[PDB]
Predict the structure.
Amino acid sequence: FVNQHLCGSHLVEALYLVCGERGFFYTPKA
Amino acid sequence: GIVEQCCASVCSLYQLENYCN
């Protein structure tokens, strides 16, 4: 699921699945 | 940043994990 173009909700879903209980930061302008 | 690396171009686990806390 990760080795593709991931945009928008699809990118946040991949971060969610990969990062698990760590959580993540989603910074689309930085 | 993430959009350039994973949306405009093909993402990687290696790069996603850099955004994990």
Q: What stands out?
A: The helical segments of chain B are 2-7, 13-17. The interface with chain A takes residues 1-3, 6-13, 16-17, 19-21 of chain B (CB under 8 Å). The radius of gyration of chain B is 8 Å.
